From a paper:
AMPylation (adenylylation) is an evolutionarily conserved PTM characterized by the covalent addition of adenosine monophosphate (AMP) to the hydroxyl side chains of amino acids in protein substrates. We developed a strategy to enrich for AMPylated proteins using the histidine triad nucleotide-binding protein, hinT. Although its physiological substrates are still unknown, in vitro characterization of hinT revealed high-affinity purine nucleotide binding and phosphoramidase activity. To investigate the structural mechanisms of AMPylated protein binding to hinTHN, we used AMPylated GlnA (GlnA-AMP) as a model substrate.
GlnA forms a dodecamer composed of two hexameric rings that is ideal for cryo-electron microscopy (cryo-EM) analysis. The cryo-EM structure of hinT H101N bound to GlnA revealed up to six hinT dimers bound to the external surface of GlnA dodecamer. A Cryo-EM density map representation of the GlnA-hinT H101N complex. The dodecamer GlnA is in blue and the dimeric hinT H101N is in pink.
Author numbering:
A (entry chain F): 1 to 60, 65 to 326, 329 to 395, 405 to 469
B (entry chain E), C (entry chain I): 1 to 60, 65 to 326, 329 to 394, 405 to 469
D (entry chain H): 233 to 326, 329 to 395, 405 to 469
């Protein structure tokens, strides 16, 4: 699909507006809209100049360069709008901006191709989300508060409702996965799936999740790295907008509630060259030597990866023992962060990395995982024996500060081939350290419950 | 478009009413409606008499003269109405009223043509605005209050709403520019753009701005001075009416909230003669010597300009250090009030003056900027080197300072009869009244600071 | 009164606590309490160490040195407490801290003695205050508010009260000075006077003032500079605490309400040497040449004085024309900021400076006035003829102007080492912080004026 | 320590009698100053102050060695002097966090008060908070000082003049780990027992785990939309 096809769409669908979209360092989607008559052949060659100083980690003019292959009609805007995803390029050389996550992911794929290890990398993430009816939160000198409310919440079993309380609710850790009316999100999940199919995703399934307050997941088909990162951005956009249109509120926080299961994003990975899966072989669980080296690299650089795959303090609320935290690989053990799914055909052999959570920036997380795996392959890092059976077993970072320190001290595997720059890594670390400092310095209601009388 | 075309439009659109519009000194549109059958050939030659004594700064029987080229159908009135912009002429000589902003802008353009420096002046303003759900304000002997409420306001993260609180809101200084549902004004901005295009504006983009409580901007294509002033008036009208129709409330105040970004109107300028941009050259950032002289004039008369480009006390609550307050020109520095945008095509070479605000009267602000630039060109005022510190001049720190500088620096505005001493005095008094009100009313922050001392 | 007398009082009144009090740069009393048994002979020679880094303008271990002559029993604390006023001394040399207002006032008196012009300076200040039933104020990103409520407020003529609304209230600018029940503060003022006399003040009169929302003043007898500054501190303390005990709320703000009279502190001054008033003579209004020179100095340095006598932004909301803003001296004219009261006895001859306000730090304001007068005497500055118009100098129109003039006019304060450059800079910065807050926070009147424009 | 217990009891009960409620939490409010417990220390033998001398700020070699021991075992001490997670919301840069001694510097965690009489010479350790157990905190400070004296741990030059300067523990987990690894100076002389230290560490780790695992409203403010 090209600029000619985009210009044809503009007339086929009577498009009034075009929404240029991109992703910031934190992973949030930013969009700027231009009227359709401003889109011409020169638009796809020169882009649009915008001031990126107001973006989070880009504080120093840059060019928004549309990627026509990402053109897709917006199903939510009242006026006919076309969504084109864009890369941020330097104004003069029209080269990828060092801090652009999409550019970083594209450079990671290019480095993968250059090294000769493989031709394509396949990513399948499995994000989950929470649907709520009401969320209220605030902080000030006088205190702080968070209050989550959902009709499916078990704590509402005593709530008085206009029209009566209907009782049927999923119990705590009991929403996987009863039939309605206990499951009250069937229609919303189906409509999300249909909208995703319209927007270009291939949906594999959708269902309710373990937690009680409307935890749901829509499982979509795998895809190449940058393509699947764009697909994840579309996925989050669709979930948020559908929840808003149904009177709900979607959230991808790793751990919104205590005592109930959190939300994770298991990332399936595979490598292919000339249409041949390189992770298929005669080694453990049908893996290959390349697959074992990839696992070893991911294990070695797991703490550095955590700074990008679990970039929020809330993520380490779910990355606690008792959500796997052990850095080992096993096809059966459920305490291993890395698992090898049992698959019939070798063409579908893959490794599932389970610690990542959906709050991660898709581009940066996937790039970090791929770069760690490639470092493992290049340096032939053997991961050891499978954890089929203990303080010798390495674990994921226990805090965002630890993850950021490890990323600071372990930058080489990300700087290999120019995928990541020291400036980009420093900007990311500072941007996350600001949030970490705020959370560290704000008191805690549990701290009052524990220490007020002491 | 002429009178014959207006009379044709009346039958084509089954127009029932014609709304004659003009701008007062403060910059607010004033409209008087007449039935369509009152519009004939004699109407476009003799105008309509109206009593302007009750207008703000026009206190002493003037003529409303329609400008058919401005004819446009109103998209909001229930009855089919046609909007015609009008100049205010003296009843006898039918010459422009000295205190009419549109007449002043037209005279500024005519002076530009007469001096021979250029044929046309191009202005790209970039106003921003705030959208709110509720605004309450008042004052009395017992006290004074202002309370802003918007669903996008971060402070509503704790508010209880009927139907539940959806927690997707912009953070403070974090509304630039995430996708919905964090951005809740996509449909409103799209409707504004479509209506603006209906009313004759060329839209370039629209987006959410840095501030949290629904700050938005719709960018429109540049145009000649008087045309772009009319376009800014139409822009403000469309924004206000669309926000009203969506249940919102638009404001062009420079600084409605403290601790969040204010609203400004960056003014891009360029001069063209015989179709060639005169601001394009081999000097700094591709500028020409005339461009440098224009920058120098704007810098020299910046404080006087502030009285017209930042005519509200609230304006100087965004023109505070920690900022676009330094009177210097640079292509890279964010601290310079004058920027040279990086444009590949020399035909697009221009200077961006950053200090103005959308509360300014468009006609008067543009005329002041043009006249300062022309004074710089005529007197060959060199702006010095680009700012790539205490000696650097700054914009006026208060409306009183701006008005005093305007009082003491009238010549560059009186060149060519564009501004008249009477008009300048009327403007200064009209603004000094508001300044006195704000200066004499006590402040809640003053209570917070001094109640116990 | 000395240390022996203080130790005797401790047993005489069965004192349980001793409250050491001092004044910060802004003029607020700070108190630290110690048990009575911690007070001994060594206490009055070595003082008490305290950490002043957290005080307003004292940021860098200083000594609180009690002044036994100021010992007085607190009339409000439940436990028998003795109030001793203390100076702030450097720990090593035991010399007055450069930024201690009381030390500055003492040094001003010592300089007056050293120059030989006079032996003593007499100050009669006349502060006024407001009594309210409820005050609510706040500011945030969403807005800001202030709401004053008092039963005497004219706006309460329509309010519904439990038990009924009694309609006897002062009108706006009509509280000077009808009998009760229109005046509802007779008992409060009488209690204030009695407590003040208990605390060592000599009261002359008390009455309701012009404003409606419970403006009152209690007049006290003049006294020497430092003594009268301590008396003013005791006055403010007594007013605040008595109002609190009566369910009211006292404020010494210059201008709490718009459209009603503000609160001022007229400062009467005179100089005496060997028991003869030096301000008595055969010149205008019975003044002497030294009195005229004092007036001339005060006029010359009036703007610099304003930074200390009117140190709040709110102050310049009462120093507005339509007013005591003209820097001239006359015995009859109400427009002159300096008056010569008509007194039969030459011993009572004095000059009344009208612009100061009760929000001023008493020590710093009195020291500034005295130093300006002494500069006028030394340099023989003639104030011209009595003002019995645009050329007449006026007081500073803003706190920024006052602070700039203080920055540029420090010499008359640095004469004799009274004020130190570091102290002046600290004061200027401390006031500029508040000025910046008030300058950057938007105004409800600004919304009323500019929301639609 | 008994006096501190009586102090806390009296404060709580008087506040209750007046209708108020008192708390010794290190940091109940964000954006405003927290509550601390500066501990002044001095050793005396035969009525003679052993911290008086001709060294810096009138200190003695024993005083400097005591300071050095406190600095060396500061992180282990923190597990007892700052035994709550809230404590480390007070011990944040922007400060009392730098482990150095000075008579003037406000950033020094150890301060030497300027006192005329040598008999009153002492060292003030500023990081401890009032949530600490007085007995255990004072015992830890004394044992660290005695280890410094016994091993002649010189504290270096005073901080009268930066990543080389050691800092107090940044979290209760760090403090507990350092206490676990630095038991010897507390176990000297049988004062602390391994069982007692383990019980303390487990008891505090329970609270640390609860606070670590419960989500935060600021976390919602920051991450709900991401
Ligand atoms: Mn799942
Ligand atoms: Mn903008
Ligand atoms: Mn009076």
């Amino acid at each position: 699909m090209s600029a000619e096809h985009v210009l044809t769409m503009l007339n086929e669908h009577e498009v009034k507006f075009v929404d240029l979209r991109f992703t910031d360092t934190k992973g949030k989607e930013q969009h700027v809209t231009i009227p359709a008559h401003q889109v011409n052949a020169e638009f796809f060659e020169e882009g649009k100049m915008f001031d990126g100083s107001s973006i989070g980690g880009w504080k120093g003019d840059m060019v928004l360069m549309p990627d026509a292959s990402t053109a897709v009609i917006d199903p939510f805007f009242a006026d006919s709008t076309l969504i084109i995803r864009c890369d941020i390029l330097e104004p003069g050389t029209l080269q990828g901006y060092d801090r652009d996550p999409r550019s970083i992911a594209k450079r990671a794929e290019d480095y993968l191709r250059s090294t000769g290890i493989a031709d394509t990398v396949l990513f399948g993430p499995e994000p989950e989300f929470f649907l709520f009816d009401d969320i209220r939160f605030g902080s000030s000198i006088s205190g702080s508060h968070v209050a989550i409310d959902d009709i499916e919440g078990a704590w509402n079993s005593s709530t008085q409702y206009e029209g009566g309380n209907k009782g049927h609710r999923p119990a705590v850790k009991g929403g996987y996965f009863p039939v309605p009316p206990v499951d009250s999100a069937q229609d919303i999940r189906s409509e999300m799936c249909l909208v995703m199919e319209q927007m270009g995703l291939v949906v594999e399934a959708h269902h309710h999740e373990v937690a009680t307050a409307g935890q749901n997941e829509v499982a979509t088909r795998f895809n190449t790295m940058t393509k699947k990162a764009d697909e994840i951005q579309i996925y989050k956009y669709v979930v948020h907008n559908v929840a808003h249109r149904f009177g709900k509120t979607a959230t991808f926080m790793p751990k919104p509630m205590f005592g109930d299961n959190g939300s994770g994003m298991h990332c399936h990975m595979s490598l292919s060259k000339n249409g041949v899966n390189l992770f298929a072989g005669d080694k453990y669980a049908g893996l290959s030597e390349q697959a074992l080296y990839y696992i070893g690299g991911v294990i070695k650089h797991a703490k550095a990866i955590n700074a990008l795959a679990n970039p929020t303090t809330n993520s380490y609320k779910r990355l606690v023992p008792g959500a796997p935290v052990m850095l080992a690989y096993s096809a059966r053990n459920r305490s291993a962060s890395i698992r090898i799914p049992v698959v019939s055909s070798p063409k579908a052999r893959r490794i599932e990395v389970r610690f990542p959570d959906p709050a991660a920036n898709p581009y940066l997380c996937f790039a970090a995982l791929l770069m760690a795996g490639l470092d493992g392959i290049k340096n032939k890092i053997h991961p050891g024996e499978a954890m089929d059976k203990a303080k010798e077993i390495p674990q994921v970072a226990g805090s965002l500060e630890e993850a950021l320190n490890e990323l600071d001290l372990d930058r080489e595997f990300l700087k290999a081939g120019g995928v990541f720059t020291d400036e980009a890594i420093d900007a990311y670390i500072a941007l996350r350290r600001e949030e970490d400092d705020r959370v560290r310095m704000t008191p805690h209601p549990v701290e009052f419950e524990l220490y007020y009388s002491v």
